Design a protein around this ligand. Structure first.
Ligand SMILES: [Zn+2]
Ligand SMILES: [Zn+2]
Length: 78
């Protein structure tokens, strides 16, 4: 002899964290991919000196379609 109801409490105790500071050295940021247009864009982990512009991976994949190891364009000198 007892009662039992379904659908217990569920208080949304979730939180977030947003920020928008200037360009500062923290760990892994670097310049933003100019070709990107995500807004925010994707970090540019590449830089083609010949193109004179810094790009990311994805972009580099479309713009610089290389099948490795590096038979495509050029990058930051050694
Ligand atoms: Zn990009
Ligand atoms: Zn290039």
């Amino acid at each position: 002899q007892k009662a039992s109801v379904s659908g217990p409490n569920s208080p949304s105790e979730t939180r977030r964290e947003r920020a928008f500071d200037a360009n500062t050295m923290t760990s892994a940021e670097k310049v933003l991919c100019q070709f990107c247009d995500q807004d925010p864009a994707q970090d540019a982990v590449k830089t083609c000196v010949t193109c004179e512009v810094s790009y990311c991976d994805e972009c580099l994949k479309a713009t610089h379609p290389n099948k490795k190891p590096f038979t495509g364009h050029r990058l930051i000198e050694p």
